[PDB]
Amino acid sequence: ERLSGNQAPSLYAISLIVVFLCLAALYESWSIPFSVMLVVPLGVIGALLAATFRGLTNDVYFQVGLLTTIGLSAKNAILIVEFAKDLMDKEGKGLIEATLDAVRMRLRPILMTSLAFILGVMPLVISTGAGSGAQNAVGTGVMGGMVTATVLAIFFVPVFFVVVRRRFS
Amino acid sequence: HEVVKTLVEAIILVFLVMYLFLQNFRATLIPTIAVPVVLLGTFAVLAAFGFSINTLTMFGMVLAIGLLVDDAIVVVENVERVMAEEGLPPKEATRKSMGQIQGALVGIAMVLSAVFVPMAFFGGSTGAIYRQFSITIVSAMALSVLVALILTPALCATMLKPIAKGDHGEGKKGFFGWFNRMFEKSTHHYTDSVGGILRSTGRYLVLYLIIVVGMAYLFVRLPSSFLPDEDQGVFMTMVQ
Amino acid sequence: MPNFFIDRPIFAWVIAIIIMLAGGLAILKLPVAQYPTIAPPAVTISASY
Ligand SMILES: CCCCCCCCCCCCO[C@@H]1O[C@H](CO)[C@@H](O[C@H]2O[C@H](CO)[C@@H](O)[C@H](O)[C@H]2O)[C@H](O)[C@H]1O
Ligand SMILES: CCCCCCCCCCCCO[C@@H]1O[C@H](CO)[C@@H](O[C@H]2O[C@H](CO)[C@@H](O)[C@H](O)[C@H]2O)[C@H](O)[C@H]1O
Ligand SMILES: CCCCCCCCCCCCO[C@@H]1O[C@H](CO)[C@@H](O[C@H]2O[C@H](CO)[C@@H](O)[C@H](O)[C@H]2O)[C@H](O)[C@H]1O
Ligand SMILES: CCCCCCCCCCCC
Ligand SMILES: CCCCCCCCCCCC
Ligand SMILES: CCCCCCCCCC
Numbered sequence A: 001e002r003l004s005g006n007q008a009p010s011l012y013a014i015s016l017i018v019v020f021l022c023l024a025a026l027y028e029s030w031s032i033p034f035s036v037m038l039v040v041p042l043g044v045i046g047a048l049l050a051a052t053f054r055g056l057t058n059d060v061y062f063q064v065g066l067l068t069t070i071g072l073s074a075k076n077a078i079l080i081v082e083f084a085k086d087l088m089d090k091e092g093k094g095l096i097e098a099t100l101d102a103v104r105m106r107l108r109p110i111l112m113t114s115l116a117f118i119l120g121v122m123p124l125v126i127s128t129g130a131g132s133g134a135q136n137a138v139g140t141g142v143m144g145g146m147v148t149a150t151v152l153a154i155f156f157v158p159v160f161f162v163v164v165r166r167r168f169s
Numbered sequence B: 001h002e003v004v005k006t007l008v009e010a011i012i013l014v015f016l017v018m019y020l021f022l023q024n025f026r027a028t029l030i031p032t033i034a035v036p037v038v039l040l041g042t043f044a045v046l047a048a049f050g051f052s053i054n055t056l057t058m059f060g061m062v063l064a065i066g067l068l069v070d071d072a073i074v075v076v077e078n079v080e081r082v083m084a085e086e087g088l089p090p091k092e093a094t095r096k097s098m099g100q101i102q103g104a105l106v107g108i109a110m111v112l113s114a115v116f117v118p119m120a121f122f123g124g125s126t127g128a129i130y131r132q133f134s135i136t137i138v139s140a141m142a143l144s145v146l147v148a149l150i151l152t153p154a155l156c157a158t159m160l161k162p163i164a165k166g167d168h169g170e171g172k173k174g175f176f177g178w179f180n181r182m183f184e185k186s187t188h189h190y191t192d193s194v195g196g197i198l199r200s201t202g203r204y205l206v207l208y209l210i211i212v213v214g215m216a217y218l219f220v221r222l223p224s225s226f227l228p229d230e231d232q233g234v235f236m237t238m239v240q
Numbered sequence C: 001m002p003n004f005f006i007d008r009p010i011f012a013w014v015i016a017i018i019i020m021l022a023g024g025l026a027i028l029k030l031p032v033a034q035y036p037t038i039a040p041p042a043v044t045i046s047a048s049y
């Protein structure tokens, strides 16, 4: 207890920095990464709501389930931003037109994944019997996080990209 | 064994949600085959690194499924979209589709590794717990990309049914006929909605700050624990 | 590879920054000594009559 305790902000600060750097290399831009990194909270709110309204705690299973939720939501945002930038760079489309083409093309695969995984973790949410405490804890945070991440991201990612692209020329 | 059962159940539920969108048996198997191939592969990587089959590594497999199907779905869906927009045969659309996303798939895995790797550097007691998830999930993602570059393309070129240019399955009769027309209309409603959001913009930046402050409040209110107390079908009573 | 990073100087910086990060973090946790283990090990049996 007394020798060492709570090194959480340190490792997730590095994580946040390295994710930014990796995105900066991917997009060849110091600014465009922010359009993807601003989706993190969209999946966190839903996980926190789910865990709060089921009387669960911020534990290991909530944390790893939240990193998974952030992973997919960020991955969805990356492919939306990538498709938009492609249309602007290669096809030479406008900011708005390209962003609308991106989200239009990326809707089906986003929902396909979201529904598959949300429904896939249903057995864990409603789980009873041996180890249900861990199953309930995993599924609850993920299901809650995935639904907010899915519904919010599809409307917010296009705002993030358009807003970020405009502030930085 | 209860977590192993929810893996099987999750793969079956993945299959059904895939059949709702792809609407043909062969196409539905491409994402459904990719998951167990990667997951089984992940067990061999845990074996190489001296890790064990445990609650945390097993839940690593369950959480991984989301990242695995997405890799497979991104590849399969994009081929279907190319086939529908241009009318290329499966083999040509596959070559084309892989050409424009294979770079991103590899890039995404390195961005996502930067999310999961860090918590493998927690120290002492808590360290080993978080390290089980990190290595399980990161190993699965690595295999997922390698499976997305070898098998998924090969299956897409051989198992996917040729789609004619402009055909979004709206001409089908039955449930798929109605669903395809519902989704195509819903996609127009979506883009029309986003198109309107992009004109406002400012009122969503302020709404986003509300979601972030809402998040912050819930985070500090929510009590923090470590690992739940499980009913293990046994307990003890002390007489002093 | 040189031609690739000539057109992508941000990628070039990212690789360099990540390497400096791993190093900066490493320094904090590295042991300090005059030498490593340079001495061959010894075992002593002690008895009394
Ligand atoms: C499709 C995705 C993959 C799903 C996940 C894969 C399943 C994971 C199972 C985890 C638990 C496995 O636990 C492992 O079970 C196998 C049998 O199956 C046992 O192996 C057994 O082999 C034979 C099987 O008849 C027995 O006669 C023998 O007694 C025993 O050695 C191992 O001793 C045990 O350690
Ligand atoms: C300690 C080790 C230090 C090394 C750390 C390295 C981490 C950085 C990884 C970031 C991931 C980058 O991911 C990589 O992005 C570049 C962006 O030019 C993509 O590259 C692609 O981008 C566009 C495509 O329109 C073209 O300019 C380029 O020709 C093409 O290859 C790759 O397809 C992708 O794999
Ligand atoms: C507490 C968090 C709440 C999360 C909410 C997340 C978003 C919810 C789903 C998106 C629904 C928004 O609905 C969408 O709003 C925009 C802007 O108001 C509307 O846009 C409409 O009004 C604006 C201005 O009044 C016009 O410039 C535009 O031409 C017109 O279409 C869209 O017609 C509507 O479809
Ligand atoms: C793939 C990433 C490998 C992670 C390396 C684990 C480091 C564990 C040492 C932490 C100190 C006990
Ligand atoms: C012609 C294309 C060459 C692309 C070279 C990228 C390799 C980067 C490796 C970085 C290792 C640290
Ligand atoms: C650690 C990230 C450093 C960001 C570089 C800033 C770019 C400015 C270019 C004008």
Ligand SMILES: CCCCCC
Binding pocket: A006, A008, A058, A063, B224
């Ligand atoms: C271990 C400190 C709390 C974790 C918050 C995500």
Ligand SMILES: CCCCCC
Binding pocket: B001, B002, B004, B005
């Ligand atoms: C209770 C169903 C059997 C568990 C092993 C998969």
